[PDB]
């Protein structure tokens, strides 16, 4: 990872920590459950809900995501939507 990418991320993380008065871990973990998306993460930290009408990711969801099973994948698509599922795979790569 490049220094510019880390610097930008550190800036964002620090702003969120001050704006919502949260510790490093809470903010970092929020990003992890929201696949690194700024808007969704900030909306989540502010209201407890993403702005797109879908839930954040859980350990079981991440485990399910790696199952080569059609029924499992359909259940994930219904729970998160095809777009978010695609972004999760990309994020977890």
């Amino acid at each position: 990872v490049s220094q510019p990418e880390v610097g930008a991320a550190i800036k964002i993380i620090r702003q969120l920590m001050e704006k919502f008065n949260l510790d490093l871990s809470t903010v970092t973990q929020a990003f992890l459950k929201n696949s690194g998306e700024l808007e969704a993460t900030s909306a989540f930290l502010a209201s407890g809900q993403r702005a797109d009408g879908y839930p954040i990711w859980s350990r079981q969801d991440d485990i399910d995501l790696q199952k080569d099973d059609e029924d499992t994948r359909e259940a994930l698509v219904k729970k998160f939507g095809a777009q978010n599922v695609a972004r999760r795979i990309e994020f977890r790569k």
Binding site: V1, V6, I13, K33, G36, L38, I56, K93
Partner: protein, 33 residues
């Protein structure tokens, strides 16, 4: 969007603990409450 490894590097940098690697893994492993 902050990539997963970029997020890890940022967390490790800001944390300042030699324990950061394992701590990050725990945040990814545990559900957020």
């Amino acid at each position: 969007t902050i990539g997963m490894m970029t997020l890890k590097a940022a967390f490790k940098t800001l944390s300042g603990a030699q324990d950061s690697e394992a701590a990050f893994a725990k945040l990814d492993q545990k559900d957020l409450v």
